[PDB]
Amino acid sequence: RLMWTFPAYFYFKKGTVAEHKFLSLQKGPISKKNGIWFPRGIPDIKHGRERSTKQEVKLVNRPVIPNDRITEADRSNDMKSLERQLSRTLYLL
């Protein structure tokens, strides 16, 4: 809500193939237009963002897929295994 506008003009150069994709991914804010009632106040826009609200910015070549935090050992409840709890401190008894 309090975050700044994303300065897209810096990270994406004007008239470039990379910028175009980013633009397509994004959706713009509703501008103020004369002779119309905006019952959620008049749009306050600068660098293409509604100042009155939170901004959302949607974004080898491979998707980064993280591994499951629960394990096979955990599922089986194998007490002798070391991979059975990954978020806790295990002690040898």
Binding site: W4, D44, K46, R51, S52, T71
Partner: protein, 113 residues
Amino acid sequence: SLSPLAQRVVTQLSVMSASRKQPKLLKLAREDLIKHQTIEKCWSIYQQQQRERRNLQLELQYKSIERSMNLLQELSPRLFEAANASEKGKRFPMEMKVPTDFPPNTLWHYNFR
């Protein structure tokens, strides 16, 4: 007026600057404000409790160590001496890494050296 380098510098400056990039102020209703206060205060209390728990635990550990070392001194002087050495250049092992967000492909290495 300005060179391309000058332009790029200006752009860079803008990235850092608060000029026409920041939203409206976060205004709240009085009820909302109260709710926020209660959220924050409770959280702070919880954090304090956690700190005390950890601090208490540390104190307990210290006491246990003290108890041990006195006993060692009483019984076996050589063992006590061995225990109480300067550990000036003691280095944590490079395998004890800072726990990541998600685990690796190979969770644990059974062979070494």
